[PDB]
Design a protein around this motif. Structure first.
Motif, PDB file in Angstrom:
ATOM      1  N   UNK A   8     -32.866  -9.794 -19.379  1.00  0.00           N
ATOM      2  CA  UNK A   8     -33.748 -11.297 -18.588  1.00  0.00           C
ATOM      3  C   UNK A   8     -33.094 -12.635 -18.355  1.00  0.00           C
ATOM      4  N   UNK A   9     -32.020 -13.085 -19.231  1.00  0.00           N
ATOM      5  CA  UNK A   9     -30.604 -13.787 -18.977  1.00  0.00           C
ATOM      6  C   UNK A   9     -30.247 -13.651 -18.014  1.00  0.00           C
ATOM      7  N   UNK A  24     -33.691 -10.931 -29.165  1.00  0.00           N
ATOM      8  CA  UNK A  24     -35.467 -10.827 -28.983  1.00  0.00           C
ATOM      9  C   UNK A  24     -36.123 -10.526 -27.464  1.00  0.00           C
ATOM     10  N   UNK A  25     -35.613  -9.194 -26.896  1.00  0.00           N
ATOM     11  CA  UNK A  25     -35.744  -8.331 -25.844  1.00  0.00           C
ATOM     12  C   UNK A  25     -35.414  -9.593 -24.525  1.00  0.00           C
TER      13      UNK A  25
END
Length: 21
Positions: free
Chosen positions: A9-10, A4-5
């Motif tokens: 990011x994380x 989920x893209x």
């Protein structure tokens, strides 16, 4: 598709973590 893209990011935000803490 990149969890989920998230994935980067994380990884990036948490490792950035405000100059290691």
């Amino acid at each position: 598709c990149s969890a989920s893209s998230l994935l980067d990011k994380e990884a990036v935000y948490f490792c950035h973590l405000d100059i290691i803490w």
